[PDB]
Design an enzyme around this catalytic site. Structure first.
Site, PDB file in Angstrom:
ATOM      1  N   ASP A  69      82.591  16.842 -46.870  1.00 44.42           N
ATOM      2  CA  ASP A  69      83.014  17.233 -48.225  1.00 44.42           C
ATOM      3  C   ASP A  69      82.197  18.442 -48.698  1.00 44.42           C
ATOM      4  OD1 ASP A  69      83.868  17.322 -50.924  1.00 44.42           O
ATOM      5  OD2 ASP A  69      82.833  15.433 -51.520  1.00 44.42           O
ATOM      6  N   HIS A 127      77.582  12.209 -54.270  1.00 39.72           N
ATOM      7  CA  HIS A 127      77.799  10.816 -53.898  1.00 39.72           C
ATOM      8  C   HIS A 127      77.519  10.586 -52.422  1.00 39.72           C
ATOM      9  CE1 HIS A 127      81.614  12.546 -52.285  1.00 39.72           C
ATOM     10  NE2 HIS A 127      81.502  13.289 -53.356  1.00 39.72           N
ATOM     11  N   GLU A 174      79.483  22.737 -53.317  1.00 37.80           N
ATOM     12  CA  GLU A 174      79.231  21.430 -52.701  1.00 37.80           C
ATOM     13  C   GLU A 174      79.063  21.526 -51.184  1.00 37.80           C
ATOM     14  OE1 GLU A 174      82.646  18.648 -52.936  1.00 37.80           O
ATOM     15  OE2 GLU A 174      81.172  16.969 -52.911  1.00 37.80           O
ATOM     16  N   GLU A 185      77.161  18.141 -55.098  1.00 40.04           N
ATOM     17  CA  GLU A 185      78.100  19.094 -55.714  1.00 40.04           C
ATOM     18  C   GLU A 185      77.734  19.428 -57.161  1.00 40.04           C
ATOM     19  OE1 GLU A 185      82.020  17.111 -56.233  1.00 40.04           O
ATOM     20  OE2 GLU A 185      81.156  15.333 -55.194  1.00 40.04           O
ATOM     21  N   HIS A 230      83.403   7.921 -51.634  1.00 36.36           N
ATOM     22  CA  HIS A 230      82.426   7.500 -52.657  1.00 36.36           C
ATOM     23  C   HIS A 230      81.874   6.117 -52.284  1.00 36.36           C
ATOM     24  CE1 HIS A 230      85.034  10.535 -54.671  1.00 36.36           C
ATOM     25  NE2 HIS A 230      83.868  10.949 -55.098  1.00 36.36           N
ATOM     26  N   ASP A 277      87.618  22.921 -52.965  1.00 38.58           N
ATOM     27  CA  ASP A 277      86.970  21.699 -52.450  1.00 38.58           C
ATOM     28  C   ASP A 277      87.757  21.157 -51.252  1.00 38.58           C
ATOM     29  OD1 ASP A 277      85.172  19.085 -54.305  1.00 38.58           O
ATOM     30  OD2 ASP A 277      85.507  19.234 -52.101  1.00 38.58           O
TER      31      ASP A 277
HETATM   32  C1  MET Z   1      90.446  13.625 -55.650  1.00 35.77           C
HETATM   33  S1  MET Z   1      90.213  14.347 -54.076  1.00 35.77           S
HETATM   34  C2  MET Z   1      88.771  15.349 -54.380  1.00 35.77           C
HETATM   35  C3  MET Z   1      87.437  14.683 -54.043  1.00 35.77           C
HETATM   36  C4  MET Z   1      86.278  15.628 -54.430  1.00 35.77           C
HETATM   37  N1  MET Z   1      86.134  16.626 -53.318  1.00 35.77           N
HETATM   38  C5  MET Z   1      84.964  14.892 -54.483  1.00 35.77           C
HETATM   39  O1  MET Z   1      83.922  15.377 -54.101  1.00 35.77           O
HETATM   40  O2  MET Z   1      84.956  13.778 -54.926  1.00 35.77           O
HETATM   41 MN   LIG Z   2      84.420  17.726 -52.851  1.00 41.30          MN
HETATM   42 MN   LIG Z   3      82.171  15.308 -53.338  1.00 39.35          MN
END
Ligand code: MET
Ligand SMILES: [Mn+2]
Ligand SMILES: [Mn+2]
EC number: 3.4.11.18
Length: 295
Positions: free
Chosen positions: A93, A153, A280, A187, A161, A82
């Site tokens: 992300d 999210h 994701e 994701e 988020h 990730d």
């Molecule tokens: C705790 S850092 C990781 C974030 C993770 N990539 C997410 O989608 O929330």
């Molecule tokens: Mn992520």
């Molecule tokens: Mn994410």
């Protein structure tokens, strides 16, 4: 509020992700893998939106190496990479699941296809629960179980988020309507377990949340650093290990967490230790379609 920045971050994220897959070979030290990926993000002119997460098997997410971490990659390991990049706050992300030294299997296909399914239905005016349905059916129809307490999210500038989730299951009340300008991270998570994740030690990822009075000096000083250098984006424990000794660092962190100055992100493990797969992508919602900035 640039679509360029969002897209730039998107392409950078993709680049470092695809490369991460090639380096994810048996014998590879997790620590080395992590610092290579993060190093590659800056060389490209980007910044980590968060420490690159490297989760293996039953470990669903929120795991990032640390200085002295001996964890090493081996053949068969369902590794979830990730990656997160941001350009002046504009985040990207994305993640993939690779089974080290082998090919993609059913479980992985379930998560991937779930993603593809969700993306194909994503359109302005569509209620989020539609995505959920699409995701859930791709995973279940394959005999696997979606993870119910892990989901996509909404994403906003310097805010990973945003407060609106995209669950991996269909829920009658997820009636938020995707609109032009919205940025979401989808994701889907699939497992051979119960399909629920739980918190377990250690705590390797944190995030600044609030500036609160702190008695102890070292702790107070650290808080100021976190705030100044990591702002409102998650950071890794590893990134601070060169600042002070282990003992002091942990105490500081522990204190700040207590005072409610920062969030602690404990490692997430499947409730039945069932292997977990995750895919994701980050998308931008437009009038006529969505744009997968990370594909
Ligand atoms: C705790 S850092 C990781 C974030 C993770 N990539 C997410 O989608 O929330
Ligand atoms: Mn992520
Ligand atoms: Mn994410």
């Amino acid at each position: 509020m640039d679509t360029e920045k969002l897209m730039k971050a998107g392409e950078i994220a993709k680049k470092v992700r695809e490369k991460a897959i090639k380096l994810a070979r048996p014998g590879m030290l997790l620590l080395e893998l992590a610092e290579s990926i993060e190093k590659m993000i800056m060389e490209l002119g980007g910044k980590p939106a968060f420490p690159v997460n490297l989760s293996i098997n039953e470990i669903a997410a929120h795991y990032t190496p640390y200085k002295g971490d001996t964890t090493v990659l081996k053949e068969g390991d369902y590794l979830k990479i990730d990656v997160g990049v941001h350009i002046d706050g504009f985040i990207a992300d994305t993640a993939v699941t690779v089974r080290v030294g082998m090919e993609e299997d059913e479980l992985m296909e379930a998560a991937k296809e779930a993603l593809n399914a969700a993306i194909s239905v994503a359109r302005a005016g569509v209620e989020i629960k539609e995505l959920g349905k699409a995701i859930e059916n791709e995973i279940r129809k394959r005999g696997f179980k979606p993870i119910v307490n892990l989901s996509g999210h909404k994403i906003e500038r310097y805010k990973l988020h945003a407060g609106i989730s995209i669950p991996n299951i269909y829920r009658p009340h997820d009636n938020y309507v995707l609109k032009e300008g919205d940025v979401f991270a989808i994701e889907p998570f699939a497992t051979i377990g119960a399909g629920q994740v739980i918190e377990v030690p250690p705590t390797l990822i944190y995030m600044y949340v609030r500036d609160v009075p702190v008695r102890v000096a070292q702790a107070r000083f650290l808080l100021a650093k976190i705030k100044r250098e990591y702002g409102t984006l998650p950071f890794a424990y590893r990134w601070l290990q060169n600042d002070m000794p282990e003992g002091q660092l942990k105490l500081a962190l522990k204190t700040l967490e207590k005072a409610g100055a920062i969030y602690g992100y404990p490692v997430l493990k499947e409730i039945r230790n069932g292997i977990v797969a995750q895919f994701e992508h980050t998308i931008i919602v437009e009038k006529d379609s969505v744009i997968v900035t990370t594909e």
